[PDB]
Design an enzyme around this catalytic site. Structure first.
Site, PDB file in Angstrom:
ATOM      1  N   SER A  53       0.867  -1.229   0.000  1.00 26.11           N
ATOM      2  CA  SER A  53       0.000   0.000   0.000  1.00 26.11           C
ATOM      3  C   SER A  53       0.889   1.260   0.000  1.00 26.11           C
ATOM      4  O   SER A  53       1.599   1.548  -0.986  1.00 26.11           O
ATOM      5  CB  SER A  53      -0.982  -0.137   1.207  1.00 26.11           C
ATOM      6  OG  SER A  53      -1.777   1.076   1.521  1.00 26.11           O
ATOM      7  N   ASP A  75      -9.917  -4.090  -4.437  1.00 23.78           N
ATOM      8  CA  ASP A  75      -9.218  -2.936  -3.884  1.00 23.78           C
ATOM      9  C   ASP A  75      -9.491  -1.672  -4.707  1.00 23.78           C
ATOM     10  O   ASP A  75      -9.238  -1.589  -5.932  1.00 23.78           O
ATOM     11  CB  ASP A  75      -7.729  -3.238  -3.954  1.00 23.78           C
ATOM     12  CG  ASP A  75      -6.778  -2.283  -3.238  1.00 23.78           C
ATOM     13  OD1 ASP A  75      -7.215  -1.180  -2.825  1.00 23.78           O
ATOM     14  OD2 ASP A  75      -5.602  -2.699  -3.023  1.00 23.78           O
ATOM     15  N   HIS A  82      -7.896  -5.201  -0.313  1.00 25.72           N
ATOM     16  CA  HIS A  82      -6.820  -4.416   0.250  1.00 25.72           C
ATOM     17  C   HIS A  82      -6.490  -4.881   1.655  1.00 25.72           C
ATOM     18  O   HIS A  82      -7.378  -5.095   2.467  1.00 25.72           O
ATOM     19  CB  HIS A  82      -7.141  -2.906   0.150  1.00 25.72           C
ATOM     20  CG  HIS A  82      -5.982  -2.052   0.477  1.00 25.72           C
ATOM     21  ND1 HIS A  82      -5.090  -1.738  -0.509  1.00 25.72           N
ATOM     22  CD2 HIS A  82      -5.477  -1.521   1.602  1.00 25.72           C
ATOM     23  CE1 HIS A  82      -4.132  -0.952  -0.006  1.00 25.72           C
ATOM     24  NE2 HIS A  82      -4.332  -0.813   1.248  1.00 25.72           N
TER      25      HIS A  82
END
Ligand SMILES: *[C@](=O)([N][C]C1=[C][C]=[C][C]=[C]1)C1=[C][C]=[C][C]=N1
Ligand SMILES: *[C@](=O)([N][C]C1=[C][C]=[C][C]=[C]1)C1=[C][C]=[C][C]=N1
Lengths: 309, 309
Positions: free
Chosen positions: B154, B246, B276
């Protein structure tokens, strides 16, 4: 200057010194001979393999010759590879790509079934994709297997993608678990920087490409000629490899990019410092053995992941 | 309807039933606790590993805490992974990603060094990339290795890319041999279909993303905030993984496609039917174990090929 492996440069120098016509000055039978002679001089031999069988299968315009390679014929049913040779839809046969097929069978430890599909100009577009689709459905219908792995080089790389798309839209009796287009063509146009950079002196030339295109007489609006122009969503896990000095490189990259943008699991390899056609040049360009082995190792893993799911 | 694994649906039903404030209603310290508690409830344990050491190293604004994981500490000198945890540049620490780092070390059989980089809003952009770069140069200058593998999830996925570009342009004492961005952020904007499709109800929400961006206060024109907007040529071999549900998916796809277009060897994986943040949710979502193992197996191969050449 563009990065070129020393052994590639050495092979190119050799080729450039040879006397004899250009392929594009020849009638199709003489071009076909030239590729066979090239393989004899510059490819490795078939080598040791447990089973090689030739046979005919029914096709929509008559018999289609195939060749089955298997280095472990008493295997339980597993994935099977269907392979479509290159040669710009005009040249190539079961002999020109024989060494590579035998190697593929050894490394992958699956059967490989090469298709001798109809060639132009005797059979122009779309004879090749019709034969490849039919032979692939036949394998699924008739050969002991759990799934298919489609692969092929240049023209055969187009035929890989095109056949994958046809089977996506209308499933065969077995699923396509992975595809492996090798320096594929995916469009008919030449508006690519790689074509301007590598269209002379790197084996696959502007002249050759024109001669192939003219003989094949593809319809540019048809998905079977220009798969890059149609949606790629839902295709199988792809291993796509290019050669960094190939006029086709950029379209290969473009296709791999499209697949990703469509959510297709995609492994992109680029054979840095080598040329179009290396998979049949592994004696004249020793470094090709590494490009072959490296690709097929990765493909074996893609298939083992598919099989263990 | 979008494909969602059963176990992911089950985890999201749990997440949606939780009471109390949402992360975006909290101050940084409350968001930070929220993530720690999430990991305690829904991540696996660190598990058995031979060596874990904490150390402080010099950085341009003060000491940078790092943690070394090694499951084979008498190893010969080989590659080392440098890991940058996610948490939107505001949350996360060495504890939140501890299980995953220990797993990585076990599966990759290389040391993993996680970086406790400075977090916003106490230290806004560009403190994180400054710290990640300085720590990475320090590992290369000070730790016995032959090369670096950069990875992170991320925010940490952005930092992987951004640090790789910095080292491309100005080499560290050791080469970056591969990178592994996991569901990375690569831009500041939200003009992505995946954002519109998944920005509610799939853990990472429009609200959370707004809160993270507001505290981090990145400059959208700076390569360290928006690497998708600058050239990717010459990056190392890349393994980039997305999660299909995501909001960040489409930018991840776009970045992987950009790498290919730039001729970087790229493996794109998409974790189909999950969310995610899965790499810290491997108890709550048991299928995340397979996403983790599957990616790390592939990375291990990319690394063995780099080292074998
Ligand atoms: C292609 O099939 N080329 C194969 C090949 C040609 C000459 C030597 C070795 C291999 C091809 C080329 C161009 C466009 C489409 N297909
Ligand atoms: C990111 O780091 N997200 C990590 C994460 C947040 C909350 C829970 C679990 C993991 C991120 C998200 C959006 C933009 C940038 N970075």
């Amino acid at each position: 200057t563009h990065y070129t492996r020393p052994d590639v440069a050495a092979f190119l120098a050799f080729l450039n010194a040879q006397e004899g016509p250009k392929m594009e000055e020849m009638p199709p039978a003489g071009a076909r001979e030239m590729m066979r002679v090239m393989g004899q001089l510059a490819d490795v031999p078939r080598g040791e393999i447990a089973k090689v069988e030739d046979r005919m299968i029914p096709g929509p315009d008559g018999d289609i010759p195939i060749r089955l390679y298997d280095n472990r014929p008493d295997r339980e049913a597993g994935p099977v590879m269907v392979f479509y040779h290159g040669g710009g839809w005009v040249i190539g046969d079961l002999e020109t790509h024989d060494p590579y097929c035998a190697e593929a069978a050894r490394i992958l430890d699956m059967p490989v079934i090469a298709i001798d599909y109809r060639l132009a100009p005797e059979h122009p577009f779309p004879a090749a994709p019709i034969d490849c689709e039919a032979a692939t459905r036949w394998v699924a219908d008739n050969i002991a297997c759990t799934g298919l792995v489609l692969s092929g080089d240049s023209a055969g790389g187009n035929l890989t993608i095109v056949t994958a798309l046809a089977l996506r839209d209308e499933p065969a009796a077995k699923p396509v678990i992975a595809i492996h287009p090798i320096y594929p063509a995916v469009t008919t146009h030449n508006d690519w920087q790689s074509y301007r950079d590598f269209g002379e002196g790197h084996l696959l030339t502007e002249g050759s490409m024109t001669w192939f295109g003219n003989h094949y007489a593809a319809d540019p609006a048809d998905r079977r000629a220009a798969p890059i122009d149609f949606p790629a969503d839902g295709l199988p896990p792809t291993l796509l490899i290019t050669a960094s000095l190939d006029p086709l490189r950029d379209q290969g990259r473009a296709y791999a990019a499209k697949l990703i943008e469509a959510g297709v699991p995609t492994t992109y390899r680029e054979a840095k410092g080598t040329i179009h056609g290396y998979i049949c040049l592994a004696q004249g360009i020793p470094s090709a053995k590494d490009d072959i082995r490296g690709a097929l190792t990765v493909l074996k893993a893609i298939v083992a992941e598919a099989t263990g799911a």
